[PDB]
Amino acid sequence: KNIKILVIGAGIAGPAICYWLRRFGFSPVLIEKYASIRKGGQALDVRGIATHIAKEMGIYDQICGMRTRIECGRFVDSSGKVLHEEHGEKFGFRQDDEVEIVRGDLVEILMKTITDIPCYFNQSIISIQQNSDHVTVNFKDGQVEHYDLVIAADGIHSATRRMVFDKNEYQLIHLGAYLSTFTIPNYLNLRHIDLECEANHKLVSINNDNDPEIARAGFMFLSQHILKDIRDEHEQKQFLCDTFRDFGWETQNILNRMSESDDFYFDAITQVKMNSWTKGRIALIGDAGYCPSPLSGQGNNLAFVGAYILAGELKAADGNYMQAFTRYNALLRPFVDANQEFGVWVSKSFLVEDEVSKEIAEERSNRTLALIKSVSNAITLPQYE
Amino acid sequence: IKILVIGAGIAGPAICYWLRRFGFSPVLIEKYASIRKGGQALDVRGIATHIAKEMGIYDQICGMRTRIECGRFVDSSGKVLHEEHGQDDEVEIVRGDLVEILMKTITDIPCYFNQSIISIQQNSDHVTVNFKDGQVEHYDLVIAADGIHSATRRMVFDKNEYQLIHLGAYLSTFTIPNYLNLRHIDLECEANHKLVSINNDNDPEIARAGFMFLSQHILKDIRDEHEQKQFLCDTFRDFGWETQNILNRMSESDDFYFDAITQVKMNSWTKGRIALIGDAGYCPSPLSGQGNNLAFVGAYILAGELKAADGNYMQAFTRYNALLRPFVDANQEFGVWVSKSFLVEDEVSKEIAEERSNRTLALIKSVSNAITLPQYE
Amino acid sequence: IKILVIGAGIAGPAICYWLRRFGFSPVLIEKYASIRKGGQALDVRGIATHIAKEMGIYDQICGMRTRIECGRFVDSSGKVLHEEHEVEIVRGDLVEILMKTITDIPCYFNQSIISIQQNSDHVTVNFKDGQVEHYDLVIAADGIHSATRRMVFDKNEYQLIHLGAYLSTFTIPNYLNLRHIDLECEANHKLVSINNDNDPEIARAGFMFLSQHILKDIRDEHEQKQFLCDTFRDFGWETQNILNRMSESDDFYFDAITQVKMNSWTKGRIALIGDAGYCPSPLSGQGNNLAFVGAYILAGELKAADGNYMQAFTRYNALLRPFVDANQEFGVWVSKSFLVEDEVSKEIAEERSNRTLALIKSVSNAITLPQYE
Amino acid sequence: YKNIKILVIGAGIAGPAICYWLRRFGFSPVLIEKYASIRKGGQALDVRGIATHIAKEMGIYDQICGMRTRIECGRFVDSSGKVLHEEHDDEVEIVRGDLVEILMKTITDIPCYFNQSIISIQQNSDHVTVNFKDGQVEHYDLVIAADGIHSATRRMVFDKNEYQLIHLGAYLSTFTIPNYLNLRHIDLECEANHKLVSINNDNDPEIARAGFMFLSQHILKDIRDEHEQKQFLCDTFRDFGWETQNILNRMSESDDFYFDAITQVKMNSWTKGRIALIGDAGYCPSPLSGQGNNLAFVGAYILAGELKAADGNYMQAFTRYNALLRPFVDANQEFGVWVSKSFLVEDEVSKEIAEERSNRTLALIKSVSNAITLPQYE
Ligand SMILES: Cc1cc2nc3c(=O)[nH]c(=O)nc-3n(C[C@H](O)[C@H](O)[C@H](O)COP(=O)(O)OP(=O)(O)OC[C@H]3O[C@@H](n4cnc5c(N)ncnc54)[C@H](O)[C@@H]3O)c2cc1C
Ligand SMILES: Cc1cc2nc3c(=O)[nH]c(=O)nc-3n(C[C@H](O)[C@H](O)[C@H](O)COP(=O)(O)OP(=O)(O)OC[C@H]3O[C@@H](n4cnc5c(N)ncnc54)[C@H](O)[C@@H]3O)c2cc1C
Ligand SMILES: Cc1cc2nc3c(=O)[nH]c(=O)nc-3n(C[C@H](O)[C@H](O)[C@H](O)COP(=O)(O)OP(=O)(O)OC[C@H]3O[C@@H](n4cnc5c(N)ncnc54)[C@H](O)[C@@H]3O)c2cc1C
Ligand SMILES: Cc1cc2nc3c(=O)[nH]c(=O)nc-3n(C[C@H](O)[C@H](O)[C@H](O)COP(=O)(O)OP(=O)(O)OC[C@H]3O[C@@H](n4cnc5c(N)ncnc54)[C@H](O)[C@@H]3O)c2cc1C
């Protein structure tokens, strides 16, 4: 199985499928557009059947070792006055094998699992073509490589999806919200605490977990505005500075340190709707194919499942990408629908701030806990040895 | 450090192993669709046996050694003139079997067949390679191990910088069905500056034919197999003996090989980020009997000098050329020394012939140990 | 988990590899001072060939396979009568490969167990040098004459069956200058062979004969050679030249063709594998293949039981019973006509041989191997 | 590889450390522990000097950094609880228990038998006879003791003429209790009358670690009798005040009680035949040196390395081991004595003088921690 396979994107789906592809006898090559591993991102939750895959890969103990250590959580008003304080109650109500871990720590654990897999950074594809025999990949530095299969794991803004799929074959659905997170110097000397302030359909957060020198800032807000270019960091940062102008609290102290952050992340809360995630010798995995959006809390787990099934089906098809890709599209269909529908469900209430009572709030919260456990296990994983 | 190695013969695979063991990540290509296993018996000799032991393949090679029990020199009619019945100085092993052993040591290294380069450029930062299938790849280093007719040397070095010297003789060998039911025996017939051999060793169904003759003729296109075979037939048109029985089975052969006995002469074997190893740089010719050994030493030293220099190819390449020079000269000079009498068939005393044979065996023994290997641990 | 494997033959090394591959840390002991590489050509066949593949030695076994190119049957005066022109490998070569596969497993030599006891917690093993060790499990692979079987199992729980024949084989210098040939001479229900495979300096001699006699002490080497010389006193041909060179041979082997019949091969925390539990005898040609399967299944069942030997040993006996019966019975089937020399033509003999080839292939695949990762 | 039968006694720091390096070098050791589970007691330790390089080559440095102590505030208080002072080179501070855990996770491929202990040892020129508590008799090519200051193996193998235990005039005790004060990432300490009482919390919010250190020339009738230890500790702190009675009341709820005199082991050599002492069993530099764990690191490294360098020839290996460690043991043991000249002496001095003594202590331990150049065994 010396089949040439290209995997685009050193995020979560990308590194995960590289491990499984190698474990099943294939020889993948991994590329990343940025000069180094992007370890940004808020805390993620490895949950449901994804924990089972994590245990199979042999990383579940590492993930448990690098789990979030926040000891206290405070919601405050714009004056800093405490309204609600928690000390870990949130984690009790949740699923059993769920583990919360900062995204970059999870990516680092995944990158250590594929140290024997080639990985080239600062590598950008400019165009892709394919025929019955091979895929042609053209790189910005002048290289032209031929591959038997190409797998895209470059995120919801997948440039591969745009180079391979027509506009009539994929739809991006805006859920009326935006998310941003970045690390800054811990100017508040916070220790194992998360502070959040919600007002006027906006949320501002700042936390400290392990590194006492660094704090992670977070912004979430409702909006239907669309950027001229969702990939222009300068427009992203200006839009964030304008929406949170006059919010008060620690917003300006946070945004003033935004320029010295090395892990900036900003995106719209969006979903990718496709009838198929494969075209010829090219397959999409993770957010590139079926992003459930941050509001589902399931993007990383769907990345895990999609990587395992695609690599497994290729093993079961003895390299017949025609059959594997077809089974891949079918097996993941119910799981994608459950998770994406859950995400839309959450968006109906997210930051709405409708004047509801504790009864209404507790019912939505408990129904979210039940709904997310069923969704996280909405599929039974096959076996491939 | 991305490294391309060109040619899956002896030098190529062997340097892939030594680059991998020293930490590098080589990639190998081969022009032909499958590994080429043709060739006559070769000898792993001298300091090259030490390299083989360090590679962990010495026992395997010994296990695959030739097992010819009898060697008969015969006249054109079949009458036996001379008969013979024949160490860690030397292990004789058919070329194909040694190639197989080398390949099995680099199963973790990617090897791409039916792949050949049409253009090669380099700057101070990388080498750019354009392949026949339209691919373009950048490499930190390119090591050419594509043999005497190396296209890489032709595209990188000017006509001024290399010279191919014809030693006035030709070689051809191929396997045919063992129609004579030979068993661990080699039959040879020499006459009129020509030699015809046929042997059976390890596969009872297969016999290996061999032709060697003196000639100062040069083919119009040495790459044309049709010309090669036509020239071979014209040269042995009426040699007699089993010549026709052998040539008529040539079309059934899967491993036909034919070439002139040639040496490659260069003052340096490197240019920028591109280095040559094996026959592509310093072919000692079949008449030296040391090509594969000089390929082992060339691979081991080049990989080691890249390790000792921490990837500074400038340092490693200069060290490479210097350390290899005395070993190349001794082996090429021995090759030419052999060609002075090869198939000349001068009327000499049986004592003289025996004496020149003793001197040849003594000379190759010393030549095969002409340098001390550096240690790279 | 402390696990003791007794015997560095074929079954022993095989189960050590598998136990290690499944997470255990076995220890291997051997009665003799060094590994015993004696023996004639054996055949890896049937499901055993798949286990060899999963162990990563199949190609190694192929590389060291036999290379005999001609077989001649000859009369006592040297005149040829007949001439002829899955992997066959000499026992010593296969034992080499298996020992290379367990370089991470300790092997202590010159070790002899003298007493064995067990309770529901551990097995206690007494050694001749005075050591006393407790083990969670003890696995016996000490061959047909298993001292462990005799110490653990009552005389009514096992039966030794003599198949009425003997076998001896040893390597001597190649004084005849044989090259890749096997010369055999059959007469009076006795067979004498001498072959040369690869090493041109050595020839391997073989002796086989029918007999109902039993030795006073089957492990006494002097009585073995006396019985051998008396049996071939006036056979003629090369018997004297071969037997006169026994003293310079370093790998003398002699044994009776025997089987071991048991209803169960485990007792508490002790398990038998290989010839010690279900020896099918040389006439079956499946001893080494039965060693492979026993080692594979026993280790696998232990892994699946997460160390619970009660479940593993129960499944070990259950899964192996069909395979053992077929191979043991196949061996008895061969003995009824082995060296008997019935009055039939060569078309009948070659007909029986064709039946044997079909039968042995079915028997060598007479079970389906479970999977354990 | 090597399949020499090697027994390593003691699952602390030196023991697990040497099991790793022996296996890395081609050996197959076996580990035993007297107690039924791994002992994770003890105060914070410092991985320092050349011991940091050994930890890096073991691939545990980041794990050690990951579990580094994270006390945010340190308050020194009087017997009434009033705060008198509040505090806010590749070396890492880490609780001893967490370092033992890490080390046991680097030897997961080596057998480790708990509730195992030796009753007697014999040896001849061919093997060592180790007789076990559960009735086993085993022969070993090499036996390596890492069973601590009161090494039962040393007392079985070495005569009282070959080792000397030096009392440095002080005693130490530490044990975990329920965090009845509800402390978080803080260390509370109180010193008076040549006694020091501490109580802190770092990671487990339900558990606090108590500390006791005092000066005394008294010697226990039997140093291994816990009852005499605690009776001595309670009588020493009878009228101390502060939290001493609260802490010592919760002693019976502790699972990791540690009590010991601050002592050193003085031997001319650390080997006899096929038996070798490593760690505190041979050259314990005392807690006042702050180097026991690091000396255990270097001892395990050099003994294992010299055995590989001599291809299992214990005669040659034991000779290099004794010679090479001598200068390092000398500097660390001497530094521990030097600390004891001022430890808890409480001399009337300026805060400039006390500061100067601390600066000198830090500069000295820096050099003592790098007092030898490590050999390379590749
Ligand atoms: C830096 C970062 C921070 C994030 N933070 C959050 C967060 O706080 N909350 C949340 O819910 N989700 C976040 N996400 C998204 C989250 O990772 C995904 O929703 C999901 O968990 C994993 O999906 P994925 O691995 O398929 O895609 P991603 O995690 O988005 O990974 C895609 C990877 O491909 C790389 N890439 C993109 N384009 C190219 C290209 N042309 N060539 C090569 N490589 C390319 C990207 O740099 C990235 O490393 C973040 C993603 C990133 C990259
Ligand atoms: C099929 C064959 C048979 C031979 N038979 C004999 C013999 O009988 N006697 C003798 O003395 N010597 C023989 N030789 C030459 C002998 O192997 C060499 O003299 C020496 O032993 C090894 O040198 P080398 O590995 O550098 O070159 P070679 O052994 O010649 O190996 C060169 C390899 O590079 C490949 N190659 C060539 N051009 C290209 C290209 N443009 N791109 C990619 N790959 C390329 C070739 O297919 C071959 O696999 C033979 C070589 C070959 C290839
Ligand atoms: C030297 C030798 C030569 C053989 N030659 C042939 C042959 O030519 N043809 C044939 O059909 N079969 C032969 N056999 C038997 C053959 O190996 C088996 O039938 C089968 O292939 C493998 O069975 P086994 O590994 O269970 O037992 P064996 O191969 O017999 O191995 C048993 C091992 O246990 C050891 N052992 C015995 N008693 C003790 C003890 N008390 N303590 C510790 N270790 C002990 C033995 O020394 C031996 O190493 C031979 C066996 C041996 C040992
Ligand atoms: C529970 C405990 C707490 C400690 N607390 C401190 C502290 O607060 N401050 C300080 O400076 N030092 C402390 N030490 C000592 C410190 O670990 C050493 O100074 C050094 O760090 C490591 O030396 P070592 O591993 O050689 O010895 P140790 O750390 O003492 O390790 C000895 C090990 O051997 C085991 N053992 C003892 N006798 C036997 C036997 N007969 N059979 C089998 N195993 C046996 C012990 O249970 C222990 O696991 C403590 C040691 C222990 C065991």
Numbering used by the authors:
A (entry chain C): 3 to 387
B (entry chain A): 5 to 90, 97 to 387
C (entry chain B): 5 to 89, 100 to 387
D (entry chain D): 2 to 89, 98 to 387
Article excerpt on this structure:
These two types differ in their resistance profiles, with type 1 enzymes conferring resistance to all tetracycline antibiotics including third-generation drugs while type 2 enzymes are generally limited to only first- and second-generation tetracyclines. We determined the X-ray crystal structures of two of these new sequences from Legionella species, and confirmed anhydrotetracycline can inhibit these enzymes’ inactivation of tetracycline antibiotics.
Tet(56-2) and Tet(56-3) were also identified in the genomes of Legionella species: L. clemsonensis and L. massiliensis, respectively. The structures of Tet(56-2) and Tet(56-3) show that the FAD binds in an “OUT” conformation, a conformation that was previously confirmed in X-ray structures of other type 2 TDases. The FAD-interacting residues are conserved between both structures. Most residues in the FAD-binding pocket and the substrate/inhibitor binding pocket are conserved across the three Legionella Tet(56) structures. Apparent IC50 values for anhydrotetracycline inhibition of Tet(56-2) and Tet(56-3) were in the low micromolar range (0.3-30 µM) for tetracycline and doxycycline inhibition.
